[PDB]
């Protein structure tokens, strides 16, 4: 817990998680935020800052746009995590120039939170963003940053939410479309649990220059599998369709932005299985295997709430 941990991109979605991880183990926590006025949501940004605060999170201030504040909260702290948000993920070229010029820093976590970007066969328009994270994991590498990579795959309140349906925000109580046949494994994790994962990786010395994996076992369903369970909650069968890989890639190039984006990430975790593989030790670090002790809302306790 001697580890003192940055989080940039504090508010967002995936990042409250984070920071909320950190003081729970105990890590001296710090957060970047600028002390300026942006179109940010003001009540969310507010209560976050407020909460974060009486926590003790200590706020650095400073913009990922402004190296010399960027070097200058860098320099206060040993760990470095971009939470994924709205930062640009370019943007984290500035982030690691910061970061050289610092020199203090034991660990860096660009902003991945995804499937592992090394190890995808996806199609535009998701393909192009995938490798643009691949390219910062060059760049991390070729300057010698120490790094980790959280691949958690599928969060729960992005996909299983709606049981990777379109225009939908609810799982669908009456009918599903389900994209090939529906027996590729996913892998899920809600928000919080990757908040805990993540912090547990910085405190770990094992984590060092290599990617951490999660794919909890009663987590790793398939898409019949994850219909199958709702079926039980809400006591009633689903109607289905199934649609064969040519029509969803057909459907992809003939939709407009971002629709076409949203079917290639479902392509990419429905039908290629992006959560499916082996990992090799030398890079690979499988959470379910390093961190047995984390209790993990399961996706039937996830959906419960839906019930």
């Given at each position: 817990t001697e580890n003192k941990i940055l989080i940039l991109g504090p508010t967002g979605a995936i990042g409250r998680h984070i920071v909320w991880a950190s003081i729970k183990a105990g890590n001296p926590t710090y957060a970047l935020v600028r002390k300026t006025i942006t179109a940010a949501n003001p009540e969310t940004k507010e209560e976050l800052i407020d909460n974060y605060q009486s926590l003790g999170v200590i706020l650095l201030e400073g913009d990922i746009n402004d190296h010399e504040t960027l070097v200058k909260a860098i320099k206060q702290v040993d760990i470095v995590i971009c939470a994924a948000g709205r930062l640009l993920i370019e943007d984290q070229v500035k982030i690691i120039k910061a970061i050289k010029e610092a020199g203090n820093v034991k660990k860096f976590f660009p902003s991945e939170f995804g499937l592992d970007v090394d190890r995808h066969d996806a199609v535009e328009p998701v393909r192009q963003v995938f490798e643009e994270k691949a390219s910062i994991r060059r760049v991390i590498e070729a300057e010698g940053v120490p790094y980790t990579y959280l691949c958690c795959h599928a969060f729960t309140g992005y996909f299983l939410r709606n049981l990777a349906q379109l225009d939908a925000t609810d799982p669908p109580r009456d009918k599903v479309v389900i994209l090939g046949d529906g027996n590729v494994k996913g892998a899920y994790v809600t928000e919080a649990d990757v908040g805990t994962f993540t912090i547990?990786?910085?405190?770990?010395?094992?984590?060092?220059?290599?990617?951490?994996?999660?794919?909890?076992?009663?987590?790793?369903?398939?898409?019949?599998?994850?219909?199958?369970?709702?079926?039980?909650?809400?006591?009633?069968?689903?109607?289905?369709?199934?649609?064969?890989?040519?029509?969803?890639?057909?459907?992809?190039?003939?939709?407009?932005?971002?629709?076409?984006?949203?079917?290639?990430?479902?392509?990419?975790?429905?039908?290629?299985?992006?959560?499916?593989?082996?990992?090799?030790?030398?890079?690979?670090?499988?959470?379910?295997?390093?961190?047995?002790?984390?209790?993990?809302?399961?996706?039937?306790?996830?959906?419960?709430?839906?019930?």
């Open positions: 547990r990786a910085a405190n770990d010395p094992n984590t060092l220059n290599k990617a951490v994996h999660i794919r909890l076992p009663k987590n790793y369903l398939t898409q019949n599998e994850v219909i199958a369970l709702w079926e039980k909650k809400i006591g009633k069968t689903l109607e289905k369709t199934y649609v064969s890989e040519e029509q969803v890639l057909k459907d992809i190039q003939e939709s407009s932005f971002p629709h076409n984006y949203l079917l290639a990430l479902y392509h990419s975790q429905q039908i290629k299985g992006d959560a499916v593989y082996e990992i090799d030790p030398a890079k690979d670090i499988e959470a379910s295997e390093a961190y047995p002790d984390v209790t993990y809302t399961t996706a039937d306790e996830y959906l419960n709430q839906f019930v």
